[PDB]
UniProtKB/Swiss-Prot annotation, chains A, B:
Pathway: Amino-acid biosynthesis; L-tryptophan biosynthesis; L-tryptophan from chorismate: step 2/5
Catalyzed reaction equations: N-(5-phospho-beta-D-ribosyl)anthranilate + diphosphate = 5-phospho-alpha-D-ribose 1-diphosphate + anthranilate
Lineage: Bacteria, Pseudomonadati, Pseudomonadota, Gammaproteobacteria, Lysobacterales
The protein's enzyme class: transferase
Organism the protein comes from: Xanthomonas campestris pv. campestris (strain ATCC 33913 / DSM 3586 / NCPPB 528 / LMG 568 / P 25)
Gene responsible for this protein: trpD
EC number(s) on file: 2.4.2.18
Name by which UniProt lists this protein: Anthranilate phosphoribosyltransferase
């Protein structure tokens, strides 16, 4: 046990709050037991000091506790796709699902409902869509109801805090494999190691150098890979994979991609979907993932999967 | 101009808020314009980073603006006595006033009213007591009404913040000379330099190594002296001045001192009153201040001054 004042004092001494203390503390916060002023103080102390792997992991453990999980039965080849310009990850999710992955995605939510899908699915219905279509879209307000507790204080502070990086770690479907885009290059090495601490088996954490929370087409992408109990950092470029560099209609662009219309739009989707198939265990390499991704775009099966998903969400909510 | 969010972001980048920005910021805070959560965040960022001379001086400049000043006409040999076990400074104030200083003291307040004095004096009445008796006691709620604005957020945080060190800097009577006891040895060098920045002519800032906010009798005392545009730090011991070391009745102890009853109680008062006479410009040295202090204890004029003060406060408030 630790009290909020003790935690504030600890950050004032520039010291880390230990994993077990952070668990105890975040539980009090998420239960609504800590005042806005005490929360903003603790969040600031953490931010000035900068947060450690232990602090982030302990906090994310509690965020998962307050999340509504999705209990999927067939956990073969899962990937949790998460991030921080059209809906690239949303388009890539149908491609990866067509190529053989079970794809869980957070939310994009605007894209799917203007495409025919229902968004207000209960966690039991997401489990059902994953089983039937290989696609699991998780509407954040449904799966993260306790975030309302700290929403006003976060809005008043305005600055980024630890909460800005905890959401992506929640993984409510419990995928062992994660594709995560991040906001800042520092977070590539941090989040890969937090994921390892949280028990992920495989992860790719990516930041495009042109400020993209995904594998970019306009610059190199920094990648942090968790594999076989180890984290390795490296950089990829579109040219490595045979792809040229590239500097209301977001649904138009999405739809043209699934129709196999060539262009930069298709290429960035094929790239990111490829990465998802690699981390899901379906593809031997990212390059191999891209090949698979292109084939399911070409045979129209990525399109068909979007349609099976929509149709599912409309039948389920009747 | 700076916004509270900009100030919070600045401390997050471990950077100092400049003197002019701090003035603008503290004015918004003291006007009640900044939410409790935003204030606690800014205070925490400042505390983790640790505050600079510029930040403290700019903030204290605003505290003075929101204070109710005392306009004393005869400013010869003034000393502002301020701090953070009986009422030593309160007892020393009558001794120093008897020895020739015009003494302004913050509040102790409990001691004086259980001695006959009225405490709720308006700043114009304090000016009158200083002119008549050489004693000016300033009841903090009267002179610092705006501190109510941040009192709840300070109470909720629990930890020390910059406000804990701004109060002693307010100097509502505008004495050029200050005797200040502090809470922590770091504050000796800090506060001497903040006082210089605020335009003090002379100061002694003291911390007893046994945890005393005054010149101690049970250990050495760290002293920071501002004199002639320069700050010098050194240590004093009771033995340096010919005083042996020493390891409801607070009014009894006070009263016996003014009655010239020898003991450790008298000695610590003579010591601190001596320091006050030195910084006020009355005495050539601290040692010389102690001699003067002992003489006004012995001739009963320190006692008479307490009585003149009480009588004044009872006549003024009728």
């Amino acid at each position: 046990p630790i009290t909020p004042q003790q935690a504030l004092q600890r950050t004032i001494e520039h010291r880390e709050i230990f994993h077990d203390e952070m668990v105890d503390l975040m539980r009090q916060i998420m239960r609504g037991e800590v005042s806005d002023a005490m929360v903003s103080a603790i969040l600031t102390g953490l931010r000035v000091k900068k947060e450690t792997i232990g602090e982030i992991a302990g906090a994310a453990t509690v965020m998962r506790e307050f999340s509504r999980r999705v209990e999927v039965t067939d956990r073969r080849h899962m990937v949790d796709i998460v991030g921080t310009t059209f809906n690239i990850s949303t388009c890539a999710m149908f491609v990866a699902a067509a190529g053989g992955a079970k794809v869980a995605k957070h939310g994009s939510a605007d894209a799917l409902e203007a495409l025919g899908a229902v968004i207000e699915l209960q966690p039991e219905q997401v489990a059902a869509s994953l089983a039937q279509t290989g696609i699991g879209f998780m509407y954040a307000p449904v799966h993260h109801p306790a975030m309302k507790v700290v929403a006003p204080v976060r809005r008043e502070m305005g600055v980024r805090t630890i909460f800005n990086i905890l959401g992506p770690l929640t993984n409510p479907a419990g995928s062992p494999n994660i594709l995560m885009g991040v906001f800042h290059p520092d977070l590539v090495g941090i989040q890969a190691r937090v994921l390892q601490e949280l028990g992920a088996e495989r992860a790719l954490v990516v930041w495009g150098r042109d400020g993209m929370d995904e594998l970019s087409l306009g610059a190199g992408t920094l990648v942090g890979e968790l594999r076989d109990g180890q984290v390795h950092e490296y950089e990829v470029h579109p040219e490595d994979f045979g792809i040229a560099m590239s500097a209301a209609e977001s649904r138009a662009m999405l739809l043209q991609v699934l129709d196999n219309v060539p262009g930069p739009a298709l290429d960035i989707v094929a790239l990111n979907a490829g990465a998802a198939l690699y981390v899901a265990g379906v593809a031997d390499s990212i390059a191999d993932g891209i090949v698979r991704a292109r084939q399911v775009l070409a045979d129209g099966s990525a399109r068909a999967c979007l349609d099976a998903y929509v149709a599912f969400t409309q039948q389920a909510t009747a």
